[PDB]
Amino acid sequence: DEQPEPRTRRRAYLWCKEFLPGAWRGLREDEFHISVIRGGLSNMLFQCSLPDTTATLGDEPRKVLLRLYGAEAMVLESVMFAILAERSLGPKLYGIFPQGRLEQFIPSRRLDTEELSLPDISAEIAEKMATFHGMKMPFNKEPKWLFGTMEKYLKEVLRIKFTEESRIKKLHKLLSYNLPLELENLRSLLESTPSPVVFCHNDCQEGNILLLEGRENSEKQKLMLIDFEYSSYNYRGFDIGNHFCEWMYDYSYEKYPFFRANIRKYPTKKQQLHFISSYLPAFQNDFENLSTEEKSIIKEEMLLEVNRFALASHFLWGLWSIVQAKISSIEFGYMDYAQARFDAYFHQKRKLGV
Amino acid sequence: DEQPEPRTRRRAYLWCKEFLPGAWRGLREDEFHISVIRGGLSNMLFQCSLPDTTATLGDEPRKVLLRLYGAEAMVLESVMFAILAERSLGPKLYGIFPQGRLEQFIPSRRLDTEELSLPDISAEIAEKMATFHGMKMPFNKEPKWLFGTMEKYLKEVLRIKFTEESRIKKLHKLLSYNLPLELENLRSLLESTPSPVVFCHNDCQEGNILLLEGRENSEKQKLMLIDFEYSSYNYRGFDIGNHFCEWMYDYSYEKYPFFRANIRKYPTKKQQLHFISSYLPAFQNDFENLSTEEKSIIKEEMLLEVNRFALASHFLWGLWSIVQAKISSIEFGYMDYAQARFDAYFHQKRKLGV
Ligand SMILES: c1ccc(CN[n+]2cnn(Cc3ccccc3)c2)cc1
Ligand SMILES: c1ccc(CN[n+]2cnn(Cc3ccccc3)c2)cc1
Ligand SMILES: c1ccc(CN[n+]2cnn(Cc3ccccc3)c2)cc1
């Protein structure tokens, strides 16, 4: 596909030749194949490969994925990526340098929103998240990510002024909900809602779940979670409730605001039980050996836990989205998205009687 | 042993309680045990433990090693440490944060210089280095580390002016060798000395080799290489030749200049053959099957390779040491050490007839 500018082709050639082994070490300028996967100012993706006629010398890859940043956290994320790679929970790490990195190229596609509700898919997503939740990572285990982040973003939101008329409007409506009071109502609800602290993805939407090419008939091993840039030790209820929220949001819409929201698409109780029934035995591990009574009590408690934490997904991503409306160049209806999440927050409160 | 200053105890307590699981999460400041392993302005080491009376809740460690920095590379080094950890080639990585890290505590001691020449030890060092040399790492494979670094350091050396009499004296004697011309003579010699590029430790001295406690009966599994701060893709000959040079230097001397040098302690040909005879079958892996004459040709040429690259160990650490004499406050005769390495450089040249 249509090439990057010559500037980056050169740098991409150098990075591949120097960081990759076998036939890559002796590739010349004229033999280098690169095409753009995703452009933009930040987090660009290119596919890079050897000529179809060059043979590999050993077990080096024929095709790799280059990721470039654009514009502390960067050390943590790299270490995280490298660990996942070592454990076979993520794409392999082939090179790491200031401007970005070289990763394994996984033939696949992203899931669509409508696929999240398919029983086989939903069950596997549950299995993988549980596995994720169960591993050790060399990061801070005090759960300050969630309210630390909402407070930070809220503070910034109170400070924003917009220059354009309609954004000033939309902002005025959102501020009229009294966000600082509403945040303390949330804290109180969640502080009396026990949830184990675990290693969370925190952004487990369909764009971050790959359907692996050639495994489409596997029932339980056709997927992989990617993109852990928001990962942290956090309440388990947030990770699961955030995922459920994402059943309602489709970002493949091609016209402004470049998403659709549908409250009726939140998972039914039946559907939520199917997800947590798959999660628990994969997360607790002698869960199956409990009495039907005990299991049912745990499930019922977990349903309260996750639907309450779901409120924090709306509230966090609502605030985040307001800030993005000021500072991002990406074409997306950030303010309308914010209003959508806040509508769902208040609908969900009403559902719960909270 | 030794107690650190109060701010450190406090910060150390917090890092342990927040990053470590099980009984660490619920420890009070008055139950925290910490003693100093090594002080100074940079790279301090503390042992941290639970009370002898507290029980563990699960598989968390009772004792850990904290390392603090003090004064790109930092990303690479962390990713490197985390990979080694995942592969069981280094201590486990328990937490990582801007000020330093938490590592597994390996009961052990460092080897002494005189132990490097013990047959069992020398053979095992060879086996481990070869294993090291054979692994894949997500770092630059173009071998620019060695002369890139010497050039950098040389340039700084030509710029240094000292105020203290005896350092000015030592500096003038070292500059009188014409170091820029001598560097180009080294480049020419090494450009015509073939050596495979491999993942090198670059600092494989006795301070960086642990004798593992309880395995002192084991003939081949009682050691571990540590401290890969200087690691990079580099010529194999450097790694081995740098190791052989370190047979000549004892850093346990307790009076100024705080090392001793003994040229007669460099390994004999017999001793070098013992080392490479252990290395080769561990690095090539179908080496034993070759005809006695092919093996003998490979060994003889490897002896040439490593003794020529040994010159680059002297020259690099010589220059590095001159620069440390300006900018480090560590009590060490950096200038005398520089002169010792350069004496050995010229004695070695003479040995070779180069
Ligand atoms: C492109 C398209 C939509 C958006 C916002 N929409 N949104 C919903 N969830 N999240 C978390 C999330 C955060 C950052 C990036 C993706 C998801 C963000 C940003 C950029
Ligand atoms: C919409 C949004 C995100 C995704 C995948 N998820 N994801 C997580 N982080 N990023 C970076 C990133 C996100 C948005 C734009 C550039 C870089 C992307 C799929 C569909
Ligand atoms: C203990 C051991 C060796 C030395 C000096 N000399 N010297 C030459 N190479 N190296 C490795 C090295 C490099 C940087 C810092 C320490 C070691 C050290 C001082 C104290």
Side-chain angles (χ1 to χ4, degrees):
Chain A
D1 282 84
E2 281 230 54
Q3 300 248 321
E5 284 294 319
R7 201 283 184 288
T8 64
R9 177 192 174 79
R10 182 186 287 94
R11 285 156 111 236
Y13 165 70
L14 310 167
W15 285 318
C16 286
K17 190 228 189 32
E18 297 200 344
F19 281 85
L20 303 172
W24 289 96
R25 301 290 296 109
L27 199 71
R28 249 180 295 282
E29 274 279 15
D30 39 285
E31 311 126 283
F32 182 60
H33 284 87
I34 169 158
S35 60
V36 181
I37 294 170
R38 164 175 90 240
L41 287 289
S42 58
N43 232 46
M44 303 91 78
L45 300 172
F46 312 89
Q47 190 213 283
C48 300
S49 46
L50 300 173
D52 291 314
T53 62
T54 303
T56 44
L57 307 186
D59 67 16
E60 80 272 34
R62 304 199 59 91
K63 207 167 317 203
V64 300
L65 173 57
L66 166 60
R67 162 186 325 262
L68 302 186
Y69 296 129
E72 203 273 354
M74 187 270 164
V75 172
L76 294 180
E77 200 267 352
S78 302
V79 166
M80 183 284 306
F81 195 80
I83 289 170
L84 294 194
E86 290 298 312
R87 299 179 184 173
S88 311
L89 294 168
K92 281 182 277 187
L93 177 64
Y94 288 124
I96 192 175
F97 41 97
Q99 290 79 359
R101 67 189 180 231
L102 294 164
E103 308 177 12
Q104 184 189 5
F105 183 92
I106 317 283
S108 55
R109 69 175 174 75
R110 292 154 319 172
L111 292 182
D112 302 314
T113 308
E114 322 80 67
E115 291 171 315
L116 297 184
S117 60
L118 286 179
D120 291 337
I121 295 291
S122 189
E124 176 167 0
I125 295 159
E127 140 212 345
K128 296 268 195 296
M129 169 170 307
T131 303
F132 217 64
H133 284 183
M135 70 191 181
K136 318 199 178 144
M137 296 298 274
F139 308 127
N140 195 311
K141 311 202 169 38
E142 253 284 300
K144 40 197 162 191
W145 184 80
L146 182 57
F147 279 76
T149 312
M150 292 190 281
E151 274 144 20
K152 177 193 188 294
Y153 276 97
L154 169 64
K155 180 190 164 162
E156 194 62 84
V157 165
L158 294 175
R159 251 204 307 236
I160 281 182
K161 178 76 199 305
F162 287 114
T163 77
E164 272 281 309
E165 219 136 356
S166 67
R167 290 171 137 215
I168 293 156
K169 187 187 264 73
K170 286 160 192 206
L171 173 56
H172 198 261
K173 178 162 186 219
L174 286 162
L175 264 7
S176 86
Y177 298 128
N178 196 335
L179 295 184
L181 178 56
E182 197 59 43
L183 183 56
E184 298 316 311
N185 293 359
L186 188 63
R187 163 134 35 206
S188 166
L189 176 68
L190 297 186
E191 286 188 4
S192 71
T193 300
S195 187
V197 179
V198 292
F199 186 65
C200 288
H201 188 285
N202 294 326
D203 187 23
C204 180
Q205 60 135 298
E206 66 270 19
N208 290 325
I209 307 175
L210 299 177
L211 180 63
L212 296 172
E213 180 172 299
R215 318 199 181 166
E216 300 89 338
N217 282 15
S218 182
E219 189 201 335
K220 280 199 290 292
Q221 299 292 2
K222 61 179 173 287
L223 311 181
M224 175 184 277
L225 308 204
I226 59 165
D227 220 311
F228 320 91
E229 60 157 355
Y230 290 106
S231 298
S232 67
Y233 277 91
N234 191 17
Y235 304 102
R236 153 184 89 183
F238 183 83
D239 219 12
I240 295 180
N242 178 78
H243 172 69
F244 289 170
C245 287
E246 285 292 350
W247 287 39
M248 298 188 293
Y249 304 106
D250 181 342
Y251 308 107
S252 62
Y253 193 43
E254 332 232 53
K255 308 308 169 101
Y256 179 97
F258 308 104
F259 76 96
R260 299 282 210 72
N262 183 349
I263 213 84
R264 307 210 77 188
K265 278 217 207 169
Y266 196 77
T268 64
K269 182 170 166 175
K270 186 185 146 68
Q271 286 171 323
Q272 300 174 22
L273 286 173
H274 178 71
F275 186 96
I276 76 168
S277 288
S278 208
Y279 180 91
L280 286 163
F283 177 62
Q284 219 189 243
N285 264 302
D286 29 21
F287 175 83
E288 233 81 71
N289 301 334
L290 305 174
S291 73
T292 306
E293 254 265 62
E294 291 163 343
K295 283 198 273 203
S296 172
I297 279 167
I298 283 166
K299 292 196 186 165
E300 284 289 342
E301 227 168 3
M302 185 155 191
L303 285 173
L304 267 47
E305 169 201 346
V306 304
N307 280 290
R308 289 179 180 182
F309 272 88
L311 297 175
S313 176
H314 293 311
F315 203 102
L316 181 81
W317 296 122
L319 296 164
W320 177 90
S321 197
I322 296 174
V323 170
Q324 290 294 309
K326 180 84 197 161
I327 67 179
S328 159
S329 55
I330 306 190
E331 177 158 40
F332 184 81
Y334 285 108
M335 288 307 283
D336 295 352
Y337 185 70
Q339 186 59 63
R341 300 308 303 257
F342 276 107
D343 289 349
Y345 174 86
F346 291 111
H347 181 274
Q348 177 78 350
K349 281 191 74 174
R350 301 214 23 118
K351 254 183 75 192
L352 276 27
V354 157
Chain B
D1 39 20
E2 260 258 324
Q3 299 285 317
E5 309 304 331
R7 205 179 98 273
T8 308
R9 177 192 174 80
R10 205 169 288 118
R11 284 156 112 237
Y13 165 70
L14 258 160
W15 283 317
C16 286
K17 189 228 205 85
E18 298 205 335
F19 281 86
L20 302 172
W24 289 99
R25 303 289 293 108
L27 197 71
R28 308 195 297 282
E29 190 279 309
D30 61 284
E31 298 171 297
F32 182 62
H33 282 83
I34 169 157
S35 62
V36 181
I37 294 171
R38 165 175 90 241
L41 286 289
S42 58
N43 232 44
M44 305 90 76
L45 299 173
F46 312 89
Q47 189 209 198
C48 299
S49 45
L50 301 173
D52 280 326
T53 62
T54 302
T56 43
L57 306 187
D59 63 24
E60 79 271 35
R62 303 199 59 90
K63 209 165 319 202
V64 301
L65 173 57
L66 165 60
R67 164 186 324 260
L68 302 186
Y69 305 136
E72 187 189 1
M74 190 270 165
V75 172
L76 295 179
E77 153 66 5
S78 303
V79 165
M80 184 285 304
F81 193 95
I83 290 170
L84 293 193
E86 291 294 312
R87 298 180 184 174
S88 314
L89 292 169
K92 282 179 275 215
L93 176 64
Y94 286 128
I96 191 175
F97 41 96
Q99 291 79 358
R101 67 189 181 229
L102 294 165
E103 308 179 8
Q104 184 190 5
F105 182 90
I106 318 283
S108 54
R109 70 173 175 74
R110 285 94 31 86
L111 292 182
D112 303 312
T113 308
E114 322 80 67
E115 291 172 315
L116 299 184
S117 62
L118 285 180
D120 291 337
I121 293 291
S122 190
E124 176 169 1
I125 295 159
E127 278 173 283
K128 297 267 196 296
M129 167 172 303
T131 301
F132 238 64
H133 283 179
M135 69 191 183
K136 288 73 228 295
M137 297 298 274
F139 308 130
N140 195 312
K141 311 203 169 37
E142 281 286 341
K144 42 196 163 190
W145 184 80
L146 183 57
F147 278 78
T149 313
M150 291 192 279
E151 273 145 19
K152 178 193 187 295
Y153 274 96
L154 168 66
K155 179 188 176 273
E156 183 47 354
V157 164
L158 294 175
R159 255 46 150 248
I160 284 183
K161 62 83 204 137
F162 289 117
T163 78
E164 188 271 307
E165 161 201 356
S166 71
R167 289 184 253 216
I168 290 156
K169 218 75 79 61
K170 288 155 195 201
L171 174 57
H172 285 310
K173 178 164 185 219
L174 288 160
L175 263 8
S176 84
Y177 299 131
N178 197 332
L179 295 184
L181 180 56
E182 193 60 42
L183 182 57
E184 298 315 314
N185 296 355
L186 188 63
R187 161 138 32 212
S188 306
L189 176 68
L190 299 184
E191 286 182 1
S192 71
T193 301
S195 185
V197 180
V198 292
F199 183 65
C200 289
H201 185 288
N202 292 330
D203 189 24
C204 182
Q205 61 136 297
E206 64 269 21
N208 292 325
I209 307 174
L210 299 177
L211 183 63
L212 299 172
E213 181 172 300
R215 316 200 176 165
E216 301 88 338
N217 52 259
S218 185
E219 191 191 307
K220 280 200 290 293
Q221 298 291 6
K222 60 179 174 287
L223 310 181
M224 175 186 275
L225 311 203
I226 58 164
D227 219 310
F228 322 90
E229 322 151 46
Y230 291 104
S231 279
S232 67
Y233 280 89
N234 191 20
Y235 302 103
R236 152 188 88 189
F238 182 84
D239 220 9
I240 291 181
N242 175 75
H243 175 71
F244 292 166
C245 291
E246 285 292 348
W247 289 35
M248 296 188 295
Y249 304 108
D250 185 340
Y251 308 107
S252 63
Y253 191 43
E254 42 277 293
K255 308 307 172 101
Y256 181 98
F258 307 105
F259 75 94
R260 209 142 83 266
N262 183 348
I263 214 84
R264 306 211 181 124
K265 290 275 159 178
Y266 194 79
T268 64
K269 182 170 165 175
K270 195 149 191 281
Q271 287 170 325
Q272 299 180 23
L273 284 172
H274 178 69
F275 185 98
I276 75 169
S277 286
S278 211
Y279 179 89
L280 286 161
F283 177 64
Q284 218 189 244
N285 277 137
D286 307 35
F287 174 85
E288 321 73 356
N289 298 336
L290 300 174
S291 74
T292 304
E293 87 250 281
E294 204 180 342
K295 284 140 96 199
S296 172
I297 279 167
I298 284 168
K299 293 195 186 165
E300 283 288 342
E301 185 183 351
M302 183 156 191
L303 285 174
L304 186 59
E305 168 200 346
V306 305
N307 282 283
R308 286 181 173 180
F309 271 90
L311 299 175
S313 179
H314 296 314
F315 206 104
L316 181 80
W317 297 121
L319 295 163
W320 177 91
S321 196
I322 296 174
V323 172
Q324 291 294 310
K326 181 83 196 160
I327 69 178
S328 158
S329 55
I330 305 190
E331 175 179 16
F332 185 79
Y334 285 109
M335 286 308 285
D336 295 344
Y337 184 71
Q339 186 58 62
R341 301 310 302 256
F342 276 105
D343 289 348
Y345 177 84
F346 290 112
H347 179 274
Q348 179 78 349
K349 279 190 74 173
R350 303 203 341 110
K351 254 183 76 191
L352 278 25
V354 157

